[PDB]
Amino acid sequence: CKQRRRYRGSEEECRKYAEELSRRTGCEVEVECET
């Protein structure tokens, strides 16, 4: 389970979204950061 999402917001918010998702789910998630 290595999935990915495209998220819009601040760089930090994108990084926070990534870390939260990755620790929340026992898997690997990748995020893309748009603004």
Phi and psi of 27, rounded to 5°?
A: -155, -170
The single-letter DSSP state of residue 24 is: H
Q: Which residues contact 12 (CB under 8 A, 6 or more apart)?
A: none
| Nearest Cα residue to 35 out of 13, 5, 4 | 13
Distance, in Å, from the CA atom of 35 to the CA atom of 25, rounded to the nearest integer, reads 25
Exposure string over 18-35, b if 16+ CB within 10 A, otherwise e: beebeeeeeeebebebee
**H or E element at residue 31:** strand 28-34
Confirm if 22 and 28 have CB atoms less than 8 A apart: yes
Ramachandran assignment for 12, one of left (phi > 0), alpha (psi -120 to 50 degrees), beta (any other): alpha
